């Protein structure tokens, strides 16, 4: 433990997504020698699923640690130096700007940030009792421990989707409930949905809400739905219960500092560059962090290389 | 032929569009347009396509993004759009021989080489002058060749050229480069221990030849006005890219030729001034121009499109 003799780098990258990596990439061939703080989640959020098959140019078979992998390789060839942290506090009002980690603190003189998002919960005081011991936010982390069990999906996206498809190869049977009678996700997999729905074990439960998270001293045992239109409510048995209903941009360490939007970081955007300043001189944003509308992997590292572009051009209109 | 979504351009914007179209049910068909695979086919290294090892091609990775969209059964066409009428719905447009009609439409047709205007430059066009290494550097093995430019495209072909010809003579209008620092390492490199010259602080001033083609340049000194000769038997000129979008001159705003769209953070970002009709890629990006760029806004077109095409019942 040290006493904020902080390293001070000309550009730091916050994420380990494929925003930060592709930032990084970019950053490293512009000699700009990136400093890239990974967060707790290495690899972000796609090492959580199974497939990727929208990352253009990627034979069938690309799963989600494989991408990442091939990113951080990426990285780490042109010598982007990452550091195992997480940043839990700064200063954007003193230049250099300031970011506190748990294992050191960090200064810079450009901040591209792409935090990216973490899954949301429901916000029940049962939800938050079971957490641990049945309800989980993660299909590939907690999905084994349910082969041949009856599980419940809350959601009706992408993700939703996908962990009721990855759960239903384990699970005997899979309940996914979802508030609308339709999905917002792709359609392939809507379509392979619904042909576990009528062919398989998935089971709907549209216009339901999740009431109550019910179990006993040692877990989940069922959950409790309210119907949308009525408000009657039914009972559901199974052991375990996946939430799945979006993901929420980790911007709470940036509030008050930066201009935000129902916690998204808002950027210049538009036509003439500089497209990923945020409100404050030299921080830049980049990924699911900044876009609340499309969200992919490679609009993510789209973005990530516009913000390396951009900081450059700042750090260099400096010298 | 009609269908509910149309793409032009097979580079990464129109490929991606593809995938993401094929995967929304949309049975995009997609126009390859004269250069199939795009720019990067003329590249042979790709080093920031981010998550790719050591040793990308450009026509590697095109390859790639073309079985991908076919993969998802994508219906690929090879044609060239000359004429285009947005304003009846469906929208109508004529390619070489076919006409083709769609509900909503993913322009993504990119950019295509500058020439200086030089009257001898036109004049030797085919016979010595040239805009792409890669298609013509094996002609001039173990000759003098020139390059016009100071960008990555310059520095690159410079660099390819380097490997081939005896010398390459790369002719910039100012002292420094705007390529990658790493690309200007190996062009520096290359100058002090190798066989390239850098004409600095020089414009091309006239193509010089005989009856079968290029023998030299004339080169003007940007500062003092003063000229010199430099013997050479081809010229490559690599000063930027324009986008293609001639055709839709009159029926799209446009700016300096780049197709406008929406932008901003609310969503439908790829929106042109004609409501079904996105755009992607170079054809609207005058700042980034990278694949891995282009391939994003292909993504966020089809996206779009995906929601137009929806909320029409
Ligand atoms: C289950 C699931 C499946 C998906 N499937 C697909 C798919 O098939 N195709 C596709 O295109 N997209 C998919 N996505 C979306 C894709 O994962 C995201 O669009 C992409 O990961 C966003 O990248 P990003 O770099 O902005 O953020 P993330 O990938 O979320 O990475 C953010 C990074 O920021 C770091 N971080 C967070 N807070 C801090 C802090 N305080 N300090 C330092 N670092 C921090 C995190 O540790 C993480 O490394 C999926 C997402 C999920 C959840
Ligand atoms: C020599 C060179 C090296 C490069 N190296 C790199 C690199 O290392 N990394 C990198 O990220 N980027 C690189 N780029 C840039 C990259 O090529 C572009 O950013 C990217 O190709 C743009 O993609 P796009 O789909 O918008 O356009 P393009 O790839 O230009 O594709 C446009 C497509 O539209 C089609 N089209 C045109 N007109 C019509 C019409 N009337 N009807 C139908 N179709 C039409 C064309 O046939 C072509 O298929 C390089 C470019 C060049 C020239
Ligand atoms: N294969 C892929 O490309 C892939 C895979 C995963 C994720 N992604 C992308 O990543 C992003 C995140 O996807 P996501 O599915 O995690 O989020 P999303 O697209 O925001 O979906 C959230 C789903 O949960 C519902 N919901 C939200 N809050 C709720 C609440 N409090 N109670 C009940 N239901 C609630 C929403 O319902 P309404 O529909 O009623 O709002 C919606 O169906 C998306 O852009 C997605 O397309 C892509
Ligand atoms: N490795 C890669 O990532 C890679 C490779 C190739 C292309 N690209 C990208 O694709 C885009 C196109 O690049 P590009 O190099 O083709 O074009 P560019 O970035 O527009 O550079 C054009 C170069 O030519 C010079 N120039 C322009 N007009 C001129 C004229 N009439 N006479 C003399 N010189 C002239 C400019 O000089 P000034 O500098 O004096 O303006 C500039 O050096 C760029 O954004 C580029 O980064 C990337
Ligand atoms: C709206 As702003 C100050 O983030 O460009
Ligand atoms: C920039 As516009 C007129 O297409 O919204
Ligand atoms: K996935
Ligand atoms: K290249």
Redesign the pocket.
């Given at each position: 433990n040290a006493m904020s003799d902080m390293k001070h780098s000309k550009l730091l990258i916050?994420?380990?997504?494929?925003?930060?990596?592709?930032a990084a990439v970019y950053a490293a061939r512009a000699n700009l020698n990136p400093v890239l703080?990974?967060?707790?989640?290495?690899?972000?959020?796609?090492?959580?699923?199974t497939?990727?098959?929208?990352?253009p140019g990627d034979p069938e078979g690309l799963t989600?640690p494989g991408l990442?992998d091939r990113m951080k390789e990426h990285a780490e060839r042109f010598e982007t130096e990452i550091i195992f942290?997480?940043?839990?506090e700064v200063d954007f009002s003193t230049r250099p700007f300031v970011?506190k980690?748990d294992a050191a603190s960090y200064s810079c003189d450009a901040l591209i940030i792409?935090?990216?998002?973490?899954?949301k919960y429901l916000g029940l005081e049962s939800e938050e009792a079971f957490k641990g011991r049945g309800v989980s936010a993660?299909?590939?982390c907690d999905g084994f421990f349910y082969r041949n069990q009856k599980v419940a999906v809350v959601g009706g996206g992408?993700?939703a989707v996908?962990?009721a498809l990855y759960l239903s190869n384990i699970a005997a049977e899979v309940h996914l409930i979802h508030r609308r009678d339709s999905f917002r996700a792709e359609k392939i997999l809507i379509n392979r949905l619904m042909d576990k729905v009528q062919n398989g074990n998935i089971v709907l439960h549209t216009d339901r809400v999740l009431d109550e998270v019910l179990g006993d001293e040692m877990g989940v045992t069922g959950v409790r739905l309210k119907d949308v239109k009525t408000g009657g409510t039914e009972e559901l048995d199974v052991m375990g219960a996946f939430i799945?209903i979006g993901?929420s941009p980790?911007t709470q360490?940036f509030q008050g500092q930066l201009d935000m939007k129902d916690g998204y970081i808002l950027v210049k955007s538009g036509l003439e560059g500089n497209a990923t300043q945020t409100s404050v001189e030299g921080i830049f944003a980049?990924?699911?962090?900044m876009?609340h509308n499309?969200?992919?992997?490679?609009?993510?590292?789209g973005?990530?290389c516009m913000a390396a572009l951009d900081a450059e051009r700042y750090l260099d209109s400096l010298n």
């Open positions: 916050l994420g380990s997504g494929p925003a930060g990596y592709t703080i990974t967060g707790m989640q290495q690899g972000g959020q796609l090492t959580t699923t497939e990727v098959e929208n990352w989600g990442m942290d997480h940043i839990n970011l980690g792409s935090t990216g998002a973490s899954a993660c299909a590939t992408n993700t996908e962990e799945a993901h980790n360490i980049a990924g699911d962090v876009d499309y969200r992919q992997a490679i609009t993510s590292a973005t990530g």
